[PDB]
Coordinates of C-alpha atoms (C1' of nucleotides) in Angstrom, one line a residue:
Chain I
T1 CA -38.6 -6.8 79.5
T2 CA -36.5 -5.3 82.4
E3 CA -33.5 -6.8 81.2
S4 CA -33.7 -5.6 77.4
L5 CA -34.8 -2.2 79.0
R6 CA -31.8 -1.9 81.3
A7 CA -29.2 -3.0 78.5
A8 CA -30.8 -0.6 76.0
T9 CA -30.5 2.3 78.8
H10 CA -26.8 1.6 79.4
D11 CA -26.3 1.5 75.5
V12 CA -27.6 4.9 75.5
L13 CA -25.4 5.8 78.5
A14 CA -22.2 4.9 76.5
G15 CA -22.7 7.7 74.0
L16 CA -22.1 10.8 76.4
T17 CA -19.4 12.7 77.8
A18 CA -17.8 11.0 80.9
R19 CA -19.1 13.2 83.8
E20 CA -22.6 13.3 82.2
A21 CA -22.8 9.6 82.2
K22 CA -21.2 8.8 85.7
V23 CA -23.0 11.6 87.4
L24 CA -26.4 10.5 85.8
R25 CA -25.7 7.0 87.1
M26 CA -24.5 7.4 90.7
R27 CA -27.2 10.2 91.1
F28 CA -30.0 7.8 90.7
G29 CA -28.2 4.7 92.4
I30 CA -27.9 3.2 89.0
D31 CA -25.4 0.2 88.8
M32 CA -24.6 0.3 92.6
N33 CA -25.9 -0.2 95.9
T34 CA -25.4 3.5 96.4
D35 CA -27.9 6.5 96.5
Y36 CA -26.0 9.6 95.7
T37 CA -27.1 13.1 95.8
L38 CA -26.8 16.5 94.3
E39 CA -25.0 17.7 97.4
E40 CA -22.6 14.6 97.1
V41 CA -22.2 15.0 93.6
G42 CA -21.0 18.5 94.9
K43 CA -18.8 16.4 97.2
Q44 CA -17.2 14.3 94.7
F45 CA -17.2 16.1 91.2
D46 CA -16.8 19.5 92.7
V47 CA -18.9 21.5 95.1
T48 CA -21.1 23.0 92.1
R49 CA -24.7 21.7 92.9
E50 CA -27.2 23.4 90.6
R51 CA -25.1 23.4 87.5
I52 CA -25.5 19.7 88.1
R53 CA -29.4 20.2 87.6
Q54 CA -28.7 22.1 84.7
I55 CA -26.4 19.3 83.3
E56 CA -29.1 16.9 84.2
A57 CA -31.3 19.0 81.9
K58 CA -28.9 19.2 79.2
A59 CA -28.6 15.4 79.2
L60 CA -32.3 15.0 79.0
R61 CA -32.1 16.8 75.9
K62 CA -29.2 15.1 74.6
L63 CA -31.0 11.6 75.3
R64 CA -34.6 12.2 74.9
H65 CA -34.4 13.3 71.4
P66 CA -36.5 11.2 69.3
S67 CA -33.7 9.3 67.5
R68 CA -32.9 7.4 70.9
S69 CA -36.4 7.9 72.4
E70 CA -37.8 4.9 70.4
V71 CA -36.0 2.1 72.3
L72 CA -37.8 3.7 75.2
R73 CA -41.1 4.5 73.5
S74 CA -42.3 0.9 74.1
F75 CA -41.9 1.5 77.8
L76 CA -44.0 4.6 77.7
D77 CA -46.9 2.0 77.8
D78 CA -45.7 0.6 80.9
Chain V
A1 CA -33.1 -38.0 55.6
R2 CA -35.9 -35.7 57.0
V3 CA -38.7 -38.0 57.4
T4 CA -36.6 -41.4 58.2
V5 CA -33.3 -41.6 59.9
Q6 CA -32.2 -45.3 58.7
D7 CA -29.5 -44.5 56.4
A8 CA -27.7 -42.3 59.2
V9 CA -27.9 -45.4 61.5
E10 CA -26.5 -47.5 58.7
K11 CA -23.5 -45.0 58.6
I12 CA -22.8 -45.0 62.5
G13 CA -24.9 -47.8 63.8
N14 CA -26.9 -46.5 66.9
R15 CA -29.8 -44.1 67.3
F16 CA -28.3 -42.9 70.7
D17 CA -24.9 -42.0 69.3
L18 CA -26.5 -40.6 66.2
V19 CA -28.9 -38.0 68.1
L20 CA -25.9 -37.3 70.6
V21 CA -23.4 -36.5 67.7
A22 CA -26.3 -34.8 65.6
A23 CA -27.0 -32.7 68.5
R24 CA -23.4 -31.8 69.2
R25 CA -22.8 -30.5 65.5
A26 CA -25.9 -28.7 65.4
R27 CA -25.1 -27.0 68.7
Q28 CA -21.9 -25.9 66.9
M29 CA -24.3 -24.6 64.3
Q30 CA -27.1 -23.1 66.3
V31 CA -24.9 -21.0 68.3
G32 CA -21.3 -21.3 66.9
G33 CA -22.5 -20.1 63.7
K34 CA -20.1 -22.2 61.7
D35 CA -20.8 -23.1 58.2
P36 CA -22.4 -26.1 56.8
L37 CA -21.0 -28.5 54.3
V38 CA -24.1 -30.0 52.5
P39 CA -26.2 -27.2 51.0
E40 CA -28.8 -25.4 53.1
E41 CA -32.1 -26.1 51.0
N42 CA -34.1 -24.0 53.8
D43 CA -33.8 -26.5 56.5
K44 CA -33.5 -26.4 60.3
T45 CA -30.2 -27.5 61.8
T46 CA -31.5 -30.9 62.5
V47 CA -31.7 -31.9 58.8
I48 CA -28.4 -30.4 58.0
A49 CA -27.1 -32.4 60.9
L50 CA -28.4 -35.8 59.9
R51 CA -27.4 -34.9 56.2
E52 CA -23.6 -34.1 57.0
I53 CA -23.7 -37.5 59.3
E54 CA -25.4 -39.2 56.5
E55 CA -22.8 -38.5 53.6
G56 CA -19.8 -39.0 56.1
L57 CA -18.5 -35.5 57.0
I58 CA -19.2 -35.6 60.6
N59 CA -18.4 -37.9 63.2
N60 CA -17.4 -37.7 66.8
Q61 CA -13.8 -38.6 66.0
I62 CA -14.0 -35.8 63.3
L63 CA -15.4 -33.2 65.7
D64 CA -12.7 -34.1 68.1
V65 CA -10.0 -33.7 65.6
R66 CA -11.4 -30.6 64.7
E67 CA -11.9 -28.8 68.0
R68 CA -8.5 -30.3 69.0
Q69 CA -6.7 -28.7 66.3
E70 CA -8.2 -25.2 66.4
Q71 CA -7.6 -25.5 70.3
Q72 CA -4.2 -26.5 70.0
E73 CA -3.3 -23.6 67.2
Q74 CA -4.9 -21.2 69.7
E75 CA -2.7 -22.2 72.3
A76 CA 0.3 -21.5 70.1
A77 CA -1.2 -18.1 69.4
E78 CA -1.6 -17.5 72.9
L79 CA 2.1 -17.7 73.7
Chain P
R1 CA -53.3 -7.9 66.9
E2 CA -52.6 -11.1 64.8
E3 CA -50.9 -9.4 61.9
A4 CA -50.1 -11.1 58.7
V5 CA -46.4 -11.8 59.3
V6 CA -47.6 -13.4 62.5
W7 CA -48.6 -16.4 60.4
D8 CA -45.8 -16.3 58.0
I9 CA -43.4 -16.4 60.8
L10 CA -45.4 -19.1 62.8
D11 CA -45.1 -21.4 59.6
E12 CA -41.6 -20.3 59.3
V13 CA -40.8 -21.6 62.8
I14 CA -42.9 -24.4 62.8
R15 CA -41.2 -26.2 59.8
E16 CA -39.1 -29.2 61.0
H17 CA -40.1 -28.8 64.6
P18 CA -42.0 -32.0 65.5
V19 CA -44.3 -32.2 68.2
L20 CA -45.7 -35.0 70.7
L21 CA -49.2 -36.5 70.9
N22 CA -50.6 -38.4 73.7
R23 CA -54.0 -40.2 74.7
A24 CA -55.1 -41.5 77.8
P25 CA -54.5 -44.1 79.2
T26 CA -50.8 -44.2 78.2
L27 CA -50.7 -47.9 78.5
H28 CA -47.6 -48.7 75.9
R29 CA -44.9 -46.7 74.5
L30 CA -46.9 -46.5 71.2
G31 CA -49.7 -44.5 73.0
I32 CA -47.4 -41.6 72.6
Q33 CA -45.9 -40.6 69.3
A34 CA -43.9 -37.6 67.7
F35 CA -45.4 -36.2 64.6
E36 CA -44.5 -33.1 62.3
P37 CA -47.2 -30.3 62.3
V38 CA -49.5 -29.2 59.7
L39 CA -51.4 -25.9 60.4
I40 CA -54.9 -25.9 59.6
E41 CA -58.0 -23.3 60.0
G42 CA -59.8 -25.0 62.6
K43 CA -60.1 -26.0 66.3
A44 CA -59.8 -29.7 66.1
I45 CA -56.8 -31.8 65.6
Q46 CA -56.9 -34.3 62.6
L47 CA -54.8 -37.5 62.9
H48 CA -53.4 -40.3 60.7
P49 CA -56.1 -43.0 60.9
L50 CA -53.9 -46.1 60.9
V51 CA -52.3 -44.9 64.2
Chain L
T1 CA -67.1 -10.3 40.3
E2 CA -63.9 -11.0 42.2
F3 CA -62.6 -14.0 40.2
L4 CA -59.1 -15.7 40.7
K5 CA -57.2 -17.2 38.2
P6 CA -54.2 -19.6 38.3
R7 CA -50.6 -19.3 37.1
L8 CA -49.3 -22.4 35.6
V9 CA -46.1 -22.7 37.8
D10 CA -44.5 -25.9 36.7
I11 CA -44.1 -28.6 34.3
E12 CA -41.9 -31.3 35.8
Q13 CA -40.7 -33.7 33.2
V14 CA -39.2 -37.1 33.8
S15 CA -38.9 -38.4 30.1
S16 CA -40.4 -37.1 27.1
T17 CA -43.6 -39.2 27.4
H18 CA -44.0 -38.9 31.3
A19 CA -44.8 -35.6 32.7
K20 CA -46.0 -33.9 35.8
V21 CA -47.9 -30.5 36.1
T22 CA -48.6 -28.5 39.4
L23 CA -51.2 -25.9 38.9
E24 CA -52.1 -23.1 41.3
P25 CA -54.0 -21.4 42.7
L26 CA -57.5 -21.9 42.0
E27 CA -61.0 -20.9 43.8
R28 CA -62.5 -24.0 45.6
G29 CA -64.8 -25.9 43.5
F30 CA -62.8 -26.3 40.4
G31 CA -59.8 -28.8 40.9
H32 CA -62.1 -31.8 40.5
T33 CA -64.1 -30.1 37.7
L34 CA -61.0 -29.6 35.6
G35 CA -59.2 -33.1 36.4
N36 CA -62.5 -34.9 35.8
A37 CA -63.5 -32.9 32.6
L38 CA -59.8 -33.2 31.1
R39 CA -59.4 -36.9 32.1
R40 CA -62.6 -37.5 30.2
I41 CA -61.5 -35.8 27.0
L42 CA -58.0 -36.9 27.2
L43 CA -58.9 -40.7 27.5
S44 CA -62.0 -40.8 25.3
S45 CA -61.7 -38.1 22.8
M46 CA -58.1 -37.2 21.6
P47 CA -57.4 -38.1 18.0
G48 CA -54.6 -40.2 16.9
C49 CA -53.6 -43.1 14.6
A50 CA -53.2 -46.7 15.7
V51 CA -53.2 -50.4 14.7
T52 CA -56.7 -51.4 13.5
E53 CA -56.0 -54.6 11.6
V54 CA -53.3 -57.2 10.9
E55 CA -52.9 -59.8 7.9
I56 CA -50.2 -62.4 8.1
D57 CA -49.2 -65.2 5.8
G58 CA -49.9 -68.7 6.9
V59 CA -51.8 -67.4 9.9
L60 CA -55.4 -68.0 10.5
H61 CA -56.5 -67.2 13.8
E62 CA -55.0 -66.1 17.4
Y63 CA -55.5 -69.4 18.9
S64 CA -53.2 -71.0 16.0
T65 CA -49.4 -70.1 15.9
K66 CA -46.4 -69.7 13.8
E67 CA -43.6 -72.4 14.0
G68 CA -40.1 -71.4 14.8
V69 CA -41.4 -68.5 16.7
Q70 CA -40.9 -67.6 20.7
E71 CA -44.5 -65.9 20.8
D72 CA -48.0 -67.0 20.0
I73 CA -50.0 -64.6 17.9
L74 CA -51.4 -63.0 21.0
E75 CA -48.2 -61.6 22.7
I76 CA -47.6 -60.4 19.1
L77 CA -50.9 -58.6 18.9
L78 CA -50.0 -57.0 22.6
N79 CA -46.6 -56.1 20.8
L80 CA -48.7 -54.3 18.5
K81 CA -51.0 -52.3 20.5
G82 CA -47.9 -50.8 22.0
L83 CA -46.9 -49.0 18.8
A84 CA -46.0 -45.6 18.2
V85 CA -47.4 -44.5 14.7
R86 CA -48.0 -41.2 12.9
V87 CA -49.9 -40.7 9.5
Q88 CA -49.0 -37.3 8.1
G89 CA -51.0 -37.1 4.9
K90 CA -53.7 -39.6 5.3
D91 CA -56.4 -40.9 7.7
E92 CA -55.4 -44.3 6.7
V93 CA -52.2 -46.5 5.8
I94 CA -51.3 -50.3 5.4
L95 CA -47.7 -51.1 6.2
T96 CA -45.8 -54.2 5.3
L97 CA -43.1 -56.2 7.0
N98 CA -41.3 -59.1 5.5
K99 CA -38.6 -60.4 7.6
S100 CA -36.4 -63.4 7.8
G101 CA -33.3 -64.7 9.7
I102 CA -33.1 -64.7 13.7
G103 CA -33.9 -60.9 14.0
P104 CA -35.8 -60.1 17.1
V105 CA -38.6 -58.3 14.9
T106 CA -38.2 -54.7 15.5
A107 CA -40.3 -52.0 14.1
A108 CA -37.1 -50.9 12.6
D109 CA -37.3 -53.5 9.9
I110 CA -40.6 -52.1 8.6
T111 CA -40.7 -50.5 5.1
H112 CA -42.1 -46.9 6.0
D113 CA -44.1 -45.0 3.4
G114 CA -43.0 -41.3 3.5
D115 CA -46.0 -39.9 5.5
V116 CA -45.5 -42.5 8.3
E117 CA -43.2 -41.7 11.5
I118 CA -42.6 -44.4 14.0
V119 CA -41.4 -42.8 17.0
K120 CA -40.1 -46.1 18.6
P121 CA -38.6 -47.9 15.6
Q122 CA -36.8 -50.1 18.0
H123 CA -40.4 -51.5 19.1
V124 CA -40.2 -55.3 19.2
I125 CA -43.2 -57.3 17.6
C126 CA -42.1 -60.9 17.4
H127 CA -39.1 -63.4 17.5
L128 CA -37.9 -66.1 14.9
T129 CA -36.2 -68.5 16.7
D130 CA -34.7 -70.4 13.8
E131 CA -33.4 -68.4 11.0
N132 CA -35.1 -70.7 8.3
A133 CA -38.5 -69.4 9.4
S134 CA -39.6 -66.2 7.6
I135 CA -42.8 -63.9 7.7
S136 CA -44.6 -61.5 5.6
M137 CA -47.3 -59.3 7.1
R138 CA -49.2 -56.2 6.5
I139 CA -50.5 -53.8 9.1
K140 CA -53.7 -51.4 8.8
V141 CA -53.0 -48.4 10.6
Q142 CA -56.3 -46.0 10.8
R143 CA -56.8 -42.7 12.3
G144 CA -59.5 -42.2 15.0
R145 CA -59.9 -40.7 18.3
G146 CA -60.2 -42.4 21.7
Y147 CA -60.4 -46.3 22.5
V148 CA -62.6 -48.8 20.6
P149 CA -62.0 -52.7 21.3
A150 CA -62.1 -55.2 18.3
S151 CA -64.6 -57.1 20.2
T152 CA -67.2 -54.4 20.2
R153 CA -66.1 -53.6 16.6
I154 CA -66.9 -57.2 15.2
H155 CA -70.1 -56.4 17.2
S156 CA -70.1 -53.4 15.1
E157 CA -68.9 -54.9 12.0
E158 CA -71.3 -57.2 9.6
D159 CA -69.0 -56.6 6.4
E160 CA -67.4 -60.0 6.0
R161 CA -63.8 -60.4 7.1
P162 CA -61.8 -63.6 6.3
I163 CA -59.6 -65.9 8.1
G164 CA -56.3 -64.2 7.6
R165 CA -57.2 -60.6 8.5
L166 CA -57.3 -59.9 12.3
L167 CA -58.4 -57.0 14.3
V168 CA -56.9 -55.3 17.6
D169 CA -58.8 -53.0 20.1
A170 CA -57.8 -49.4 18.9
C171 CA -55.7 -47.3 21.0
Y172 CA -56.3 -44.0 19.2
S173 CA -55.9 -41.6 21.9
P174 CA -52.2 -41.5 22.7
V175 CA -52.5 -41.3 26.6
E176 CA -51.5 -44.3 28.5
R177 CA -52.3 -43.0 31.9
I178 CA -53.7 -39.7 33.6
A179 CA -54.4 -39.1 37.2
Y180 CA -55.2 -35.8 39.2
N181 CA -55.0 -34.6 42.7
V182 CA -56.5 -31.8 44.5
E183 CA -54.3 -30.5 47.2
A184 CA -54.9 -27.3 49.2
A185 CA -52.6 -24.4 48.6
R186 CA -52.0 -21.2 50.8
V187 CA -52.9 -17.7 50.2
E188 CA -51.9 -15.7 53.3
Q189 CA -55.4 -15.3 54.7
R190 CA -56.8 -18.1 52.6
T191 CA -56.1 -21.9 52.9
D192 CA -59.4 -22.7 51.4
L193 CA -57.8 -22.9 48.0
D194 CA -57.0 -25.6 46.0
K195 CA -54.2 -26.8 43.5
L196 CA -54.6 -29.3 40.8
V197 CA -51.7 -31.6 40.4
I198 CA -51.4 -34.0 37.4
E199 CA -49.6 -37.0 36.3
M200 CA -49.7 -37.8 32.5
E201 CA -47.9 -40.6 30.8
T202 CA -48.4 -41.2 27.2
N203 CA -47.0 -43.2 24.3
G204 CA -44.8 -41.4 21.6
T205 CA -46.6 -39.2 19.1
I206 CA -47.2 -36.4 21.5
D207 CA -45.6 -34.2 24.1
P208 CA -48.0 -34.4 26.9
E209 CA -48.0 -30.5 27.4
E210 CA -49.2 -30.2 23.8
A211 CA -51.7 -32.8 24.5
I212 CA -53.3 -30.9 27.3
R213 CA -53.1 -27.8 25.3
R214 CA -55.1 -29.4 22.5
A215 CA -57.6 -30.6 25.2
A216 CA -58.4 -27.4 26.5
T217 CA -58.4 -26.0 23.1
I218 CA -61.1 -28.4 22.0
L219 CA -63.2 -27.5 25.2
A220 CA -63.1 -23.6 24.6
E221 CA -63.8 -24.6 20.8
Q222 CA -67.1 -26.0 22.3
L223 CA -67.8 -23.3 24.7
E224 CA -67.5 -20.5 21.9
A225 CA -71.3 -20.9 21.2
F226 CA -72.1 -19.9 24.9
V227 CA -69.6 -17.3 25.5
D228 CA -71.8 -15.8 23.0
Chain W
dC1 C1' -46.7 -77.3 116.4
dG2 C1' -50.7 -75.3 114.4
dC3 C1' -54.6 -72.7 114.8
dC4 C1' -57.4 -68.4 115.6
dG5 C1' -58.1 -63.3 116.1
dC6 C1' -56.9 -59.2 115.4
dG7 C1' -55.2 -55.9 112.9
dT8 C1' -52.7 -53.6 108.3
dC9 C1' -52.9 -52.5 103.9
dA10 C1' -53.8 -51.8 98.2
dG11 C1' -57.6 -50.9 95.2
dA12 C1' -56.2 -47.6 86.5
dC13 C1' -55.3 -42.9 84.0
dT14 C1' -56.3 -37.8 81.9
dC15 C1' -60.3 -34.2 81.4
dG16 C1' -64.8 -31.3 83.3
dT17 C1' -69.2 -29.1 87.3
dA18 C1' -70.6 -25.9 91.6
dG19 C1' -69.9 -22.7 95.7
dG20 C1' -69.6 -23.3 100.7
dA21 C1' -70.5 -23.5 107.0
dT22 C1' -71.4 -23.2 112.2
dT23 C1' -72.8 -22.6 118.5
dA24 C1' -71.9 -19.9 122.2
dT25 C1' -69.7 -18.5 125.8
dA26 C1' -70.5 -12.0 132.2
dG27 C1' -69.2 -8.2 133.2
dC28 C1' -66.8 -3.7 135.1
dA29 C1' -62.5 -1.6 136.9
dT30 C1' -56.9 -0.3 136.5
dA31 C1' -53.4 0.7 134.5
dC32 C1' -50.3 0.6 130.9
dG33 C1' -48.3 1.0 125.9
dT34 C1' -48.7 1.7 121.0
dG35 C1' -51.0 3.7 116.9
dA36 C1' -51.9 7.7 114.0
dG37 C1' -51.6 12.5 114.8
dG38 C1' -48.8 17.2 115.3
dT39 C1' -44.2 19.9 114.5
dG40 C1' -40.2 22.8 114.3
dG41 C1' -35.7 22.3 111.4
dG42 C1' -31.6 20.5 109.2
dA43 C1' -31.0 19.4 104.9
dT44 C1' -31.8 18.8 100.7
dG45 C1' -33.3 20.2 96.3
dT46 C1' -34.7 24.1 93.0
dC47 C1' -34.5 28.5 90.4
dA48 C1' -33.2 33.2 89.3
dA49 C1' -29.2 36.1 88.8
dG50 C1' -23.6 36.9 88.5
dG51 C1' -17.6 36.0 87.9
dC52 C1' -13.7 32.6 85.4
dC53 C1' -11.8 31.0 80.2
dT54 C1' -12.4 29.2 75.1
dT55 C1' -15.0 29.5 71.5
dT56 C1' -18.0 31.8 68.6
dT57 C1' -20.0 36.0 66.3
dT58 C1' -19.0 40.2 64.8
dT59 C1' -16.0 42.8 63.1
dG60 C1' -11.2 45.5 62.7
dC61 C1' -7.9 45.6 59.3
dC62 C1' -4.0 44.7 56.1
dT63 C1' -2.0 45.3 51.8
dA64 C1' -1.7 42.5 47.5
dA65 C1' -3.4 43.9 43.6
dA66 C1' -6.5 42.0 40.6
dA67 C1' -10.5 43.8 39.3
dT68 C1' -14.2 47.4 37.4
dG69 C1' -14.8 51.5 35.1
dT70 C1' -13.7 56.0 30.7
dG71 C1' -15.7 56.1 25.9
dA72 C1' -14.4 57.0 20.5
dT73 C1' -12.5 54.2 17.1
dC74 C1' -12.7 50.3 14.2
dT75 C1' -13.9 45.6 12.6
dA76 C1' -15.2 41.1 10.5
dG77 C1' -19.8 39.4 10.0
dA78 C1' -24.6 39.7 7.8
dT79 C1' -28.5 40.7 3.9
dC80 C1' -31.9 40.2 -0.7
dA81 C1' -34.4 39.7 -5.0
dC82 C1' -32.7 38.3 -9.1
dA83 C1' -30.1 34.7 -12.8
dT84 C1' -29.3 30.7 -13.4
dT85 C1' -27.3 26.0 -12.3
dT86 C1' -26.7 21.8 -10.7
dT87 C1' -28.0 16.9 -9.3
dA88 C1' -31.0 12.7 -8.3
Chain S
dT1 C1' -36.5 17.0 -15.8
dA2 C1' -38.4 18.6 -10.9
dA3 C1' -36.6 20.7 -7.4
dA4 C1' -33.2 22.3 -4.6
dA5 C1' -28.4 25.0 -4.7
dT6 C1' -25.7 29.1 -6.1
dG7 C1' -24.0 34.0 -7.5
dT8 C1' -24.7 40.5 -7.2
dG9 C1' -22.1 43.3 -4.0
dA10 C1' -22.9 47.6 -1.6
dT11 C1' -24.5 48.7 2.8
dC12 C1' -24.7 48.3 7.1
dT13 C1' -24.3 46.6 12.9
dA14 C1' -23.5 44.5 18.1
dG15 C1' -18.9 43.9 20.5
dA16 C1' -13.9 44.4 20.8
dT17 C1' -9.7 47.8 21.6
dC18 C1' -6.9 49.9 24.6
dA19 C1' -3.6 52.4 28.6
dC20 C1' -4.6 53.8 33.3
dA21 C1' -7.0 55.8 37.8
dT22 C1' -9.6 54.0 41.4
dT23 C1' -12.5 50.4 44.5
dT24 C1' -12.9 46.7 47.1
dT25 C1' -12.4 43.3 49.0
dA26 C1' -11.2 40.0 50.0
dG27 C1' -9.5 36.3 52.8
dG28 C1' -7.5 36.0 56.2
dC29 C1' -5.0 37.5 60.2
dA30 C1' -5.4 40.1 64.9
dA31 C1' -9.0 40.3 68.2
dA32 C1' -13.0 42.7 71.1
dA33 C1' -16.4 41.3 73.1
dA34 C1' -20.7 38.2 74.1
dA35 C1' -22.4 33.9 74.9
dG36 C1' -21.9 29.2 76.3
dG37 C1' -18.9 26.6 79.6
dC38 C1' -16.9 26.8 84.4
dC39 C1' -18.0 28.2 88.9
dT40 C1' -20.5 31.1 92.8
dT41 C1' -24.3 33.6 95.4
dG42 C1' -29.0 34.7 97.2
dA43 C1' -33.2 33.1 97.8
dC44 C1' -36.9 29.7 97.9
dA45 C1' -39.3 25.3 98.4
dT46 C1' -39.9 21.3 99.8
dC47 C1' -39.0 18.2 102.2
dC48 C1' -36.6 14.0 105.3
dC49 C1' -35.9 13.1 109.7
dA50 C1' -37.4 12.2 113.7
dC51 C1' -39.0 13.8 117.8
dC52 C1' -42.6 13.8 120.1
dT53 C1' -47.8 12.7 121.4
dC54 C1' -52.3 12.1 123.3
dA55 C1' -56.5 8.5 122.6
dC56 C1' -57.7 4.5 122.0
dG57 C1' -56.9 0.0 122.7
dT58 C1' -55.2 -3.6 125.4
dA59 C1' -53.3 -7.0 129.3
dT60 C1' -54.8 -8.1 133.7
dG61 C1' -58.1 -9.0 138.4
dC62 C1' -62.5 -10.3 141.0
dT63 C1' -67.5 -11.7 141.1
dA64 C1' -68.9 -15.5 148.3
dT65 C1' -77.1 -18.6 148.2
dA66 C1' -75.6 -22.6 145.8
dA67 C1' -74.7 -26.0 142.0
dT68 C1' -69.7 -31.6 142.1
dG69 C1' -68.4 -39.4 137.0
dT70 C1' -68.5 -38.3 129.7
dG71 C1' -71.3 -40.5 126.9
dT72 C1' -74.4 -37.8 122.6
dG73 C1' -74.9 -38.5 117.9
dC74 C1' -71.7 -40.7 114.4
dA75 C1' -69.9 -45.6 111.9
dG76 C1' -71.8 -48.7 108.8
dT77 C1' -70.0 -53.5 109.1
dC78 C1' -65.6 -54.0 101.6
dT79 C1' -62.0 -57.8 101.3
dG80 C1' -58.3 -61.1 100.5
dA81 C1' -53.5 -61.5 102.2
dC82 C1' -50.0 -61.3 105.2
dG83 C1' -47.7 -60.6 110.1
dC84 C1' -47.8 -61.2 114.7
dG85 C1' -49.5 -62.2 119.4
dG86 C1' -52.1 -65.0 121.9
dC87 C1' -54.1 -69.4 122.0
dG88 C1' -54.2 -74.6 122.9

DNA sequence: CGCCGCGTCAGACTCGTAGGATTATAGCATACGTGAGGTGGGATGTCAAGGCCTTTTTTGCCTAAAATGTGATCTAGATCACATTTTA
DNA sequence: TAAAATGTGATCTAGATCACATTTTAGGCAAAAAAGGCCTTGACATCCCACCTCACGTATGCTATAATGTGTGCAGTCTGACGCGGCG
């Protein structure tokens, strides 16, 4: 369940703009031993902090979007 | 062929080599997705293996020749 | 939920898929044999009397 | 009322005379019913023509024999029960065969009335070992239905017959064999359903499909008074 | 050499059935550390308005320029009861 | 020969004509400005962190009538063969 889940997640990540996907990966510790922050996204991408919050929001629109949601919907009952 | 494995042995000669060769072929087919020779007839890969070995289309020599040739031609394609 | 395609797919996979049978005490090698499955609507195995 | 009916699925046919029939699906409690009843009407009530009596010259009783002949009388009589005959205008005919030479005696040598079809004209009857021996016989064919033995016929027959006229167990009904088999067939939730698989194997004179068709035709033709 | 005594060591195979323990042990004083509790405080994370650029939405505008209106003058179609007249 | 087709011709009737002025309006070319995209700012909210922090818990010390060799609740002894150490 975890494996098929995670592969489906990455397959959703592939479809986005670059900064979107990479930010949303490292911001959550995905794909790494890291745990990087809004502030540190400031440090790496560019110091802008809360436009990253708005970008997170926009991506959550781009991806939640029930044409992609339904690979995730079985995991609602988790 | 399905219920009895005699004529296959009459082709090759041994149970053990028969199941090894057959398993080799049906692992070329269960995973490698290569096509059959005898028709399908709605049968799991066991039966098609045992048939292709029954009528004299698959053999350890023949598998060696096939994999050999495609491997070598691949080595030519790499260079 | 035990839907209909559950059963059709069960019959789909089971075909050509043998299965082993064993009775205690497994004295000699004919005490354990490989048959083919046949599905039936009951909780009791049937068997080929000669064996 | 939530009946189910079968759909005739297959008629597998090895030769013209040997035939198989799968038949599904049926509610439980009918396969044995149909198999039995058809087996009865087939094997004991189907109409057809066959060899009733014989008359040969120089020939008295089956325990006697002809000279210059491979057979006794009996093996011939068995070569006469195994005969394909059809009458087409009448309920009775009397054929003739007058043969000579060393001809292994086929049914082809027989002189045929216009209203007679032998479906197996090659059918062998006797053998004249030397050519010098030659025969003349005549064969009563009669139309009946079922099977009736000449032993029970003489038990039945008080009207005098002579020595020279002979009698054979009547194989009117053109079947040689039938047997049925009740298997279990699957409907998705229902494996308590049953199919009826039949092997029929007859003589000439009928295609088996037609025979069965006539059997059920007869049976419904018995039932019309109580469908009422 | 040949007992005799003592001791060591195996005792078929797969399933099922139930919950389950018990005695008595001194007592108080000293003094030290660690667990559960407070507590300001970097620091992170959020949420609401503003300055850089391109794109988008209005929206100027620019001149080819074909289209939309003016109406009196016609025209080539369109009729109907009687008188035959043709064709299957 | 029944039944449908064929001439009387004067009296009409909805659209076309036909040259030229005036709109429009594209459509499409230049663009103003606004609203995303880009960043910033102030303000909040929630903390993470850890830095402490006292109560309760815990590790350790003596108590001077006198008292001084267990046992203690079990096993029930299966048995035939094989080693080995006494055992003459």
